[PDB]
Amino acid sequence: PNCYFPLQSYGFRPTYGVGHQPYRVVVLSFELLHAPATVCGPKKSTNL
Amino acid sequence: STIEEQAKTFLDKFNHEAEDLFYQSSLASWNYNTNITEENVQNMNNAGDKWSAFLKEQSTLAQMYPLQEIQNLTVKLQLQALQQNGSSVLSEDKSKRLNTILNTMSTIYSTGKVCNPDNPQECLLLEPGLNEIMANSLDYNERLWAWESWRSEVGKQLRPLYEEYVVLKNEMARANHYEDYGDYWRGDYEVNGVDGYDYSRGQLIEDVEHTFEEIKPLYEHLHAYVRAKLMNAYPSYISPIGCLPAHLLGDMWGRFWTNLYSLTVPFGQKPNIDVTDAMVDQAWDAQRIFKEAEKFFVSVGLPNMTQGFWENSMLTDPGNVQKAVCHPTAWDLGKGDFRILMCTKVTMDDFLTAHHEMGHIQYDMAYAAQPFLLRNGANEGFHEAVGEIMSLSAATPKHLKSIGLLSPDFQEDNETEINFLLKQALTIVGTLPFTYMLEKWRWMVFKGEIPKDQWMKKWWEMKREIVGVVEPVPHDETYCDPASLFHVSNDYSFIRYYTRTLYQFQFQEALCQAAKHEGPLHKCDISNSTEAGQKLFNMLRLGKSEPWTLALENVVGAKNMNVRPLLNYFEPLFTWLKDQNKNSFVGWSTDWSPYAD
Numbered sequence A: 001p002n003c004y005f006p007l008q009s010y011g012f013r014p015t016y017g018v019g020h021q022p023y024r025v026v027v028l029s030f031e032l033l034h035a036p037a038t039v040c041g042p043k044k045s046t047n048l
Numbered sequence B: 001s002t003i004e005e006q007a008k009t010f011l012d013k014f015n016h017e018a019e020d021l022f023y024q025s026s027l028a029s030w031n032y033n034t035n036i037t038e039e040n041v042q043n044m045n046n047a048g049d050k051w052s053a054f055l056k057e058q059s060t061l062a063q064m065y066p067l068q069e070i071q072n073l074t075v076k077l078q079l080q081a082l083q084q085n086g087s088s089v090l091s092e093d094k095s096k097r098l099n100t101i102l103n104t105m106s107t108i109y110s111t112g113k114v115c116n117p118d119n120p121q122e123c124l125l126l127e128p129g130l131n132e133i134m135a136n137s138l139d140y141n142e143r144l145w146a147w148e149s150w151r152s153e154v155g156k157q158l159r160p161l162y163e164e165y166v167v168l169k170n171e172m173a174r175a176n177h178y179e180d181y182g183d184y185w186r187g188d189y190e191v192n193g194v195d196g197y198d199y200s201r202g203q204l205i206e207d208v209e210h211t212f213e214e215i216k217p218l219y220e221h222l223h224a225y226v227r228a229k230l231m232n233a234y235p236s237y238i239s240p241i242g243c244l245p246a247h248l249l250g251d252m253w254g255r256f257w258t259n260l261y262s263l264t265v266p267f268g269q270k271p272n273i274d275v276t277d278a279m280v281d282q283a284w285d286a287q288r289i290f291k292e293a294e295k296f297f298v299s300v301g302l303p304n305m306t307q308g309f310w311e312n313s314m315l316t317d318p319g320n321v322q323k324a325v326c327h328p329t330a331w332d333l334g335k336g337d338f339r340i341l342m343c344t345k346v347t348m349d350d351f352l353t354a355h356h357e358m359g360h361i362q363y364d365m366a367y368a369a370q371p372f373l374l375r376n377g378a379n380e381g382f383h384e385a386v387g388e389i390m391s392l393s394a395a396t397p398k399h400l401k402s403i404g405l406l407s408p409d410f411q412e413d414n415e416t417e418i419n420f421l422l423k424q425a426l427t428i429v430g431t432l433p434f435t436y437m438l439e440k441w442r443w444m445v446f447k448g449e450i451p452k453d454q455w456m457k458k459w460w461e462m463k464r465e466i467v468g469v470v471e472p473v474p475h476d477e478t479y480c481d482p483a484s485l486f487h488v489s490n491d492y493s494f495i496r497y498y499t500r501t502l503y504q505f506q507f508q509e510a511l512c513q514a515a516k517h518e519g520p521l522h523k524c525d526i527s528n529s530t531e532a533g534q535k536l537f538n539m540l541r542l543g544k545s546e547p548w549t550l551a552l553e554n555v556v557g558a559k560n561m562n563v564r565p566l567l568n569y570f571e572p573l574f575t576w577l578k579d580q581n582k583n584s585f586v587g588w589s590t591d592w593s594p595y596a597d
């Protein structure tokens, strides 16, 4: 009676409010630490 | 360790489960009411007993928490509202007897039929004919026949059923520590444990008696004027000092005097405000009406409606292929879903009704953040009052002129405003004595102050005393004429309308004072006033987690009902009516009756 299953459901339907709308979220995390950097953006130049 | 935290956890789980269950039930209701089929009815039954079983299970689970050991007021009110067990504490046999009585008498009211004495196979139901028979026809004999036939057909059947119902309700009240069922219904306005805001059960009776005493001069002046007009209309039926007949009041029971405006118009040559011509000329539709209401509501600062409401709600009659019941009703399905259902026509009355319905929506969305147990008004009387105040504000000719529905060349004068005040009084002033009378009679039969064998005699005696209505045909105790009304015949309270009449005009006075408007109150408008909007929201937000007196003070600064706004509103009509009534008798004589010659 005081012990419950700690999982709920996200009832989603296409007739819901914007505040309750199922937004899609992805978080991007970086690290500014002294280590060999393998990933960063490109750049290009002009002509010879 | 403590009990209040256990109750808090139980309420936390209850809110989460009940949200989904009530959403399912209300969505089923919305789909049934919009599309009338049989499988929709079946889904309604399934959801209905599912929700009722959840309610009874949760009550039988949470009854074991004693209310004496909780200090937080919100959870206290939650557990008090949940712990009311209703008919369950009574024996199961009597509970089934009570529900069978309710079903039988509801069916009697809904399917009651009366046949004319000349054609046995030609019979008329109350809804789609009896009302019209006496709300459109001016013949005395037809109205008398309809009234007598309806009462003789319903009251004779419903008398013993109502006696058993009242007895069962008295046992029900004594079961849960109330003296009478009238006390159970008065329990709506009770609050305890809040200093400076408490209210007792007899305080409501005392206050309503005082308010009626303060208001009765207006009713008696209007009664004298209407009696004089009916004298000019029907010269050989009523004494100029006697009471008005029951079947000459406009509707089934004399509840409203709206019908008699045509017969009692002071100046029938002045034009009446009707924007239906402007409705059809500008090719307005339902969507434009609701956009107009939306902009009127956004003008004071309230938010516009959600997209789901404009996407999924049915804003028009669904053709002829599918049938729907479209009485004006605002639905709170929960989970941030709001809906409206009403067959919209291009009329001014539908404009005001749409404004009322979206005022209902606004009130309902105001407390959407409150818990499941507390998502309701401070009491029952705030919803419809807030709905009606918006229609009252929109009915002002100034707003219609601003929104371009009336030409600016329209000349407002004393005569048109007097006619407007008189029709408003006929709609409003007429119903207050009848609601007070009916609810007081219900109180006094529930408390047992009246033996069975003189219910009707005392009913009619006090009616001819206060409400000034005398029966044209003498009746015995075999009748149950109170059960001829929808409210009496289906277990609803009726002081709600009097409380709403007080609340709506008190709110109008407060908001008009906040709106910095000069002149008569009927011309007052609240648009373009964000101060009025924020003042409205300051009471809109709470819901009922706090005492209704505090919510009332939040908008008006007063802790109790008062009658000053109504008399201040009708003072021009007061002086006009007292000027007219100088040559007519004021008051009514209880002895005279149409059947006594």
Ligand SMILES: *[C@@H]1O[C@H](CO)[C@@H](O)[C@H](O)[C@H]1NC(C)=O
Residues within 6 Å of the ligand: B035, B037, B318, B322
């Ligand atoms: C009402 O229900 C019937 C039965 O399924 C359906 O055919 C009809 O389209 C419905 N009406 C609507 C959705 O307006």
Ligand SMILES: *[C@@H]1O[C@H](CO)[C@@H](O)[C@H](O)[C@H]1NC(C)=O
Residues within 6 Å of the ligand: B072, B073, B074, B075
């Ligand atoms: C009552 O309970 C609510 C819900 O947890 C909480 O927010 C509020 O602070 C409590 N009030 C008191 C006075 O403990």
Ligand SMILES: *[C@@H]1O[C@H](CO)[C@@H](O)[C@H](O)[C@H]1NC(C)=O
Residues within 6 Å of the ligand: B298, B304
């Ligand atoms: C809703 O109201 C806001 C604020 O007044 C306004 O900016 C917005 O355009 C409105 N949306 C609609 C659809 O009317």
Ligand SMILES: *[C@@H]1O[C@H](CO)[C@@H](O)[C@H](O)[C@H]1NC(C)=O
Residues within 6 Å of the ligand: B398, B399, B402, B525, B527, B528
């Ligand atoms: C409300 O303000 C708007 C914006 O200036 C104006 O167009 C409208 O006429 C005003 N209405 C009233 C009733 O003051």
Ligand SMILES: [Cl-]
Residues within 6 Å of the ligand: B252, B253, B254, B481, B482, B484
């Ligand atoms: Cl009646």
Ligand SMILES: [Zn+2]
Residues within 6 Å of the ligand: B328, B356, B357, B360, B384, B387
């Ligand atoms: Zn309403």
